[PDB]
Amino acid sequence: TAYDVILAPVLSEKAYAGFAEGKYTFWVHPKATKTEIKNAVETAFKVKVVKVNTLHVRGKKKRLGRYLGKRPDRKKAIVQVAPGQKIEALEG
Amino acid sequence: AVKKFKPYTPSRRFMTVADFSEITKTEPEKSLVKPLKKTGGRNNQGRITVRFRGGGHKRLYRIIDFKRWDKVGIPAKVAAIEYDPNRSARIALLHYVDGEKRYIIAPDGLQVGQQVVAGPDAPIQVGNALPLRFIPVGTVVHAVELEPKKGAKLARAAGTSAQIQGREGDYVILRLPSGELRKVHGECYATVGAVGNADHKNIVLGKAGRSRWLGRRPHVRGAAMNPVDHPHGGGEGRAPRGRPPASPWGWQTKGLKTRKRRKPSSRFIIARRKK
Amino acid sequence: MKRTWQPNRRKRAKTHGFRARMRTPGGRKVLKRRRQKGRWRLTPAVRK
RNA sequence: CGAAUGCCGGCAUGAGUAACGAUAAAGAGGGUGAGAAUCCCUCUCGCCGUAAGCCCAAGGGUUCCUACGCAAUGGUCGUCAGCGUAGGGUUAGGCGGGACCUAAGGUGAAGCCGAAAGGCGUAGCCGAAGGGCAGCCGGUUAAUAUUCCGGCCCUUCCCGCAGGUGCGAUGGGGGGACGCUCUAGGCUAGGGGGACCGGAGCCAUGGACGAGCCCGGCCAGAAGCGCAGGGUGGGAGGUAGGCAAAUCCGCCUCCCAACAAGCUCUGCGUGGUGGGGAAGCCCGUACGGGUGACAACCCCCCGAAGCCAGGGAGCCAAGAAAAGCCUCUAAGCACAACCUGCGGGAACCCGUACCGCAAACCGACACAGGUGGGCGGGUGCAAGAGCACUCAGGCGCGCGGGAGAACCCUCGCCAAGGAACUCUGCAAGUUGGCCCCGUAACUUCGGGAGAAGGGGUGCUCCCUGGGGUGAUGAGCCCCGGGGAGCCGCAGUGAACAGGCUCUGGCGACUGUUUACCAAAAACACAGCUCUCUGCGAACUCGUAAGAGGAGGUAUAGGGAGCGACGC
RNA sequence: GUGGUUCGUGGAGCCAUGGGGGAAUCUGGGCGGACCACCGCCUAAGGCUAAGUACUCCGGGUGACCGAUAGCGCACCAGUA
Ligand SMILES: [Mg+2]
Ligand SMILES: [Mg+2]
Ligand SMILES: [Mg+2]
Ligand SMILES: [Mg+2]
Ligand SMILES: [Mg+2]
Ligand SMILES: [Mg+2]
Ligand SMILES: [Mg+2]
Ligand SMILES: [Mg+2]
Ligand SMILES: [Mg+2]
Ligand SMILES: [Mg+2]
Ligand SMILES: [Mg+2]
Ligand SMILES: [Mg+2]
Ligand SMILES: [Mg+2]
Ligand SMILES: [Mg+2]
Ligand SMILES: [Mg+2]
Numbered sequence A: 001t002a003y004d005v006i007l008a009p010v011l012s013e014k015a016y017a018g019f020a021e022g023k024y025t026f027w028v029h030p031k032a033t034k035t036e037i038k039n040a041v042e043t044a045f046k047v048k049v050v051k052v053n054t055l056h057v058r059g060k061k062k063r064l065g066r067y068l069g070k071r072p073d074r075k076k077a078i079v080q081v082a083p084g085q086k087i088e089a090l091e092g
Numbered sequence B: 001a002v003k004k005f006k007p008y009t010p011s012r013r014f015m016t017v018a019d020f021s022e023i024t025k026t027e028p029e030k031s032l033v034k035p036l037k038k039t040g041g042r043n044n045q046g047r048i049t050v051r052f053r054g055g056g057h058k059r060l061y062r063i064i065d066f067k068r069w070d071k072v073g074i075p076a077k078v079a080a081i082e083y084d085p086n087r088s089a090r091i092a093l094l095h096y097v098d099g100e101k102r103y104i105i106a107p108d109g110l111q112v113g114q115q116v117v118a119g120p121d122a123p124i125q126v127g128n129a130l131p132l133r134f135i136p137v138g139t140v141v142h143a144v145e146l147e148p149k150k151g152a153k154l155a156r157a158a159g160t161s162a163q164i165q166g167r168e169g170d171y172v173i174l175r176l177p178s179g180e181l182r183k184v185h186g187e188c189y190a191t192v193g194a195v196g197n198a199d200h201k202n203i204v205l206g207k208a209g210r211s212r213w214l215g216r217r218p219h220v221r222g223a224a225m226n227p228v229d230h231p232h233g234g235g236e237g238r239a240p241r242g243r244p245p246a247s248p249w250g251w252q253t254k255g256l257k258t259r260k261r262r263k264p265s266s267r268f269i270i271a272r273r274k275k
Numbered sequence C: 001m002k003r004t005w006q007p008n009r010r011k012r013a014k015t016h017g018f019r020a021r022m023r024t025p026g027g028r029k030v031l032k033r034r035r036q037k038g039r040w041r042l043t044p045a046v047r048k
Numbered sequence D: 001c002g003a004a005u006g007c008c009g010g011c012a013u014g015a016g017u018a019a020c021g022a023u024a025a026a027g028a029g030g031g032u033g034a035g036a037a038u039c040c041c042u043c044u045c046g047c048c049g050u051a052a053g054c055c056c057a058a059g060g061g062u063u064c065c066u067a068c069g070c071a072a073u074g075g076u077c078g079u080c081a082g083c084g085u086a087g088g089g090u091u092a093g094g095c096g097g098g099a100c101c102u103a104a105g106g107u108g109a110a111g112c113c114g115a116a117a118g119g120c121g122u123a124g125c126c127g128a129a130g131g132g133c134a135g136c137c138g139g140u141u142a143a144u145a146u147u148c149c150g151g152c153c154c155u156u157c158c159c160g161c162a163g164g165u166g167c168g169a170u171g172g173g174g175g176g177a178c179g180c181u182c183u184a185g186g187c188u189a190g191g192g193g194g195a196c197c198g199g200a201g202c203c204a205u206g207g208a209c210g211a212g213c214c215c216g217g218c219c220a221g222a223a224g225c226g227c228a229g230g231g232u233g234g235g236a237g238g239u240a241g242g243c244a245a246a247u248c249c250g251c252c253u254c255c256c257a258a259c260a261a262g263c264u265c266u267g268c269g270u271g272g273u274g275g276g277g278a279a280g281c282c283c284g285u286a287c288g289g290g291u292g293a294c295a296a297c298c299c300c301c302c303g304a305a306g307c308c309a310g311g312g313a314g315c316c317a318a319g320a321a322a323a324g325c326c327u328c329u330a331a332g333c334a335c336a337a338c339c340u341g342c343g344g345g346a347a348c349c350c351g352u353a354c355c356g357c358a359a360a361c362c363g364a365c366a367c368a369g370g371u372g373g374g375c376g377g378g379u380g381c382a383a384g385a386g387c388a389c390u391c392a393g394g395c396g397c398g399c400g401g402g403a404g405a406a407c408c409c410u411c412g413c414c415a416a417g418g419a420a421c422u423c424u425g426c427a428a429g430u431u432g433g434c435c436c437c438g439u440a441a442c443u444u445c446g447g448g449a450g451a452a453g454g455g456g457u458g459c460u461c462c463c464u465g466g467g468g469u470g471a472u473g474a475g476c477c478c479c480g481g482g483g484a485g486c487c488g489c490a491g492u493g494a495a496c497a498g499g500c501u502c503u504g505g506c507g508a509c510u511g512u513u514u515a516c517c518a519a520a521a522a523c524a525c526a527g528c529u530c531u532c533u534g535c536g537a538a539c540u541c542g543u544a545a546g547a548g549g550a551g552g553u554a555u556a557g558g559g560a561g562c563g564a565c566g567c
Numbered sequence E: 001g002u003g004g005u006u007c008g009u010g011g012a013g014c015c016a017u018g019g020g021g022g023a024a025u026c027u028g029g030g031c032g033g034a035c036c037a038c039c040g041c042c043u044a045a046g047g048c049u050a051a052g053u054a055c056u057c058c059g060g061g062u063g064a065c066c067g068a069u070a071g072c073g074c075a076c077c078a079g080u081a
């Protein structure tokens, strides 16, 4: 369930910009807690998390034909890692 | 006295304001025996039951002592005479040697520094409260109870009082503020003296506001309305009533008696009123 | 001029809201009726 | 089916007609492009600027940014867009809500009532734009920022250590804690000068190298010091009260002290120090960046409606609650516990884009309407948030180009007359600020007073008196007094800016009303009278419980008519 | 005082019952349309009890039922816009 909290990396100009500092941003469970995420990240990518910021991301309303809908709402979590520490998997 | 003004504005040539001398000695009320938000509101559960009420200045409620038999025997010195927005009379804040503080509706002549006390051996004199049957017939008293232990109900408005006309069994006979002769049980507590601030009845409001400040909204006459609204409504161009003067509900309003007939409360009342 | 619709969210919820409709038999009946009718929205769509 | 102002749909007529939504306004040169008066840039021009600028709350819900785009939506056009497709974008212990408090009201253990449904209702609970509560200044993005980064500064928890103490409440007491108007002393925000520091440059068209012109001369900052203020007496004995449990509070008594001090708490100065830092020129379609300096960062003056705040005075209509907080002790427990240091940890949920007096909200519309709070510079006019011009910023109104008819609107002027107009001086004009003279009947002696009626009003030079800040001197502000003289048709030279009087009716007066044809002699109103009500009051609602009346009590309540006042 | 039944005060019984009064245990008590006497019928003031009957959201089978202005409001991504 620790690998159920982190859904995937975000991938985007802005997100990468964080990598310089220990700042990795992820798409996480809409309900996940800052504290829940800290742990999830620690055991998943074996690191020391020291700060966690999160923000909700409302889904973009879309329309394909006369059929109108929305994209699923999401939560974005940007976890800051202990000085000089890298989440290998997200580098490259 | 009463404050007059020079006609520097119309309406100001008429209003007069109370003479706040008896009062004084204190403004802010006693935080302890007054903490009680007064719940304002001119009607019951949503519906207006008493026409034309509302608006009017905010008010804190000073809780007063309408039964002094609690502290029988404990004397108390008169601390101050204050203003009380919720009554015609003023109130006297008193310090019981007990420590306990209480508010009494300030009797006429009761001065700061004096000492008052309640009970059957209370020294018959302005301020003290005793069971009627212990007060010298002929004595003028105020804040009388109507039934033993149910609290003070008669003679409380500014400058009112009752006089003991006679004794008779467990009952004593009083002459109420209305001129009525009532038999009131001898155990009913009453406090010697007249209510005070008897000058209340003479202040002239002076203007339409002021009436508003006291929380009295405009009263519209029946004649000024349409038939749907009141029996006196309608008629082309100013009417003459239409016989006979009645209320918006229908009951005649000139002389028709309203006291419940077979009321047991009779018997005990000997005389009726002033005319 | 000042028109009749003055949107207020708290108001809308407290007045037409699901819980408000439940408090009384008269409102519980509305829900029953909308449902039976197959209405997609049983209660005025509103959020915060 | 031919008819029902029939019903659904389609397409005609009017018609290339009225319209294209405020008369704040346009012109040109470049560029892009298949094509643009309509997109981009540059330069002119006009408008708003108590704004038509900036910020917050509501409401709205991606409208934000960007790349491709132009069928349609845009009242024209379109390469452009609040539009199509797609991708990005909203970061919090300290900002706002929630793991706090109570308000009306709502709900509701007990309890009451009602054919049923259901109506009440004590305690409690819920309830906010009120009380409580620790973050300010900068820098960064295409798009967030007291949230990321930087500096400086804080708050709660938990554990340990050391040192103190009767520690311990959901109970007690204090405190929270409250009005209107007018106000003092200090400050701060904000603004104005500076011959003074810093600064690219500029002497044009006759003159000026000039104290010349132009720009900038700030912000944050713990402890500690300063300056202004706010809050508070200290003792010692008794002790019936705070539904006594208290060393607390409350009362009594006397040993001190008493526009204070002291202790405390805020505000503002300063503070190690961190940051910011114009015009102009160069780079750039765009956004910006260098800059331009190692930038100076100082001095006077004006000054809040803001802060010190729980300040002071006066007044009557007499001005929430509860928690946090301090304190008291009950059970308990005193090898717990609380309290102060110091270390090491912990600190969740939601909001955060964007519009926001508007083309994104409410009005079917990119509607000349409606929308709560804060900032809202300068000069002049007596003052001001008024008026005219302008900073910063934002715009010229999302069809144009011509023509110089009738007529319509909005505006300007007019010979002689001057209300002859007309239901009516309706409309329009006249008068209009300020100062000084001077003002009638009548009057309730306040009024009528801006009554009327006049006179003055610019500028230059000379002299002279008061005050504020400095320092008592100069400056700088602020009100004046007397002289001479100058020029226009005209001196509140523009904008804002009463026409006056006499006499009747009706209401006393201020006020209220038929949201969209009536604002009035109508309603209201202080005041007067009649009448009911003895308090489980009368009356009102309700079947009832219950509630209003009123936690009121005859100088009260209810109802009715009249409507200051005079007779 | 009322309701029920065909019964609307009617000659108004029967069955229920809000009010008042108020028994007896088969030598009892109700009924047969005022009431009385005969002749009869039946056992009140406790409860339970299949089947036959009603309906159609749902599944199926049929139609001198419709055939996209018809047929359900919807043959279609409709209780939607
Ligand atoms: Mg967040
Ligand atoms: Mg209520
Ligand atoms: Mg009236
Ligand atoms: Mg009328
Ligand atoms: Mg009538
Ligand atoms: Mg009524
Ligand atoms: Mg609407
Ligand atoms: Mg509301
Ligand atoms: Mg709707
Ligand atoms: Mg036809
Ligand atoms: Mg025919
Ligand atoms: Mg037809
Ligand atoms: Mg048609
Ligand atoms: Mg045509
Ligand atoms: Mg033509």
Ligand SMILES: [Mg+2]
Pocket (backbone or CB within 6 Å): D017
């Ligand atoms: Mg034509």
Ligand SMILES: [Mg+2]
Pocket (backbone or CB within 6 Å): none
């Ligand atoms: Mg034409």
Ligand SMILES: [Mg+2]
Pocket (backbone or CB within 6 Å): none
């Ligand atoms: Mg035309």
Ligand SMILES: [Mg+2]
Pocket (backbone or CB within 6 Å): none
């Ligand atoms: Mg237009």
Ligand SMILES: [Mg+2]
Pocket (backbone or CB within 6 Å): none
């Ligand atoms: Mg136009």
Ligand SMILES: [Mg+2]
Pocket (backbone or CB within 6 Å): none
């Ligand atoms: Mg103009």
Ligand SMILES: [Mg+2]
Pocket (backbone or CB within 6 Å): none
């Ligand atoms: Mg202008």
Ligand SMILES: [Mg+2]
Pocket (backbone or CB within 6 Å): none
């Ligand atoms: Mg203006």
Ligand SMILES: [Mg+2]
Pocket (backbone or CB within 6 Å): none
């Ligand atoms: Mg919002």
Ligand SMILES: [Mg+2]
Pocket (backbone or CB within 6 Å): none
């Ligand atoms: Mg969209």
Ligand SMILES: [Mg+2]
Pocket (backbone or CB within 6 Å): none
């Ligand atoms: Mg955009």
Ligand SMILES: [Mg+2]
Pocket (backbone or CB within 6 Å): none
């Ligand atoms: Mg483009």
Ligand SMILES: [Mg+2]
Pocket (backbone or CB within 6 Å): none
């Ligand atoms: Mg077009």
Ligand SMILES: [Mg+2]
Pocket (backbone or CB within 6 Å): none
């Ligand atoms: Mg778009």
Ligand SMILES: [Mg+2]
Pocket (backbone or CB within 6 Å): none
């Ligand atoms: Mg809560």
Ligand SMILES: [Mg+2]
Pocket (backbone or CB within 6 Å): none
């Ligand atoms: Mg209730």
